[PDB]
């Protein structure tokens, strides 16, 4: 189980989702502005995408 997609840093949302869903077809993908304060709960189904103002992935996407 691959749980991080560092190779997607700098990619647009459409592109990132396409790769993530190949690896984890039933992933719950959420998009949030980078810098958003989140809680520490661990959700194995989830992959949060932190994006910058150009709507590009700003941090390494990971399961949690």
- Report the number of distinct structural domains present in the chain: 1
Quote the domain boundaries for residue 47.
1-64
C-beta neighbour count of 25 within 10 angstroms: 7
HEC string of 11-57? Answer: CEHHHHHHHHHHHCCCCEEEEEECCCCCCCCCCCCEEEEEECCCCEE
Q: Strands 46-51 and 28-33: what pairing?
A: parallel
**50 to each of 9, 14, 57, how far by Cα in Å?**
10, 13, 6
C-beta neighbour count of 22 within 10 angstroms: 8
Resolution of the model in angstroms: 2.0
What's the CATH number where 36 sits? 3.30.10.10
Q: Which method was used?
A: X-ray
DSSP annotation of 6: G
């Amino acid at each position: 189980m691959k749980t991080e997609w560092p190779e997607l840093v700098g990619k647009g949302v459409a592109a990132a989702k396409k790769v993530i869903l190949q690896d984890k077809p039933e992933a719950q993908i959420i998009v949030l502005p980078v810098g958003t304060i989140v809680t520490m709960e661990y959700r194995i189904d989830r992959v949060r995408l932190f994006v910058d103002k150009l709507d590009n992935i700003a941090q390494v996407p990971r399961v949690g």
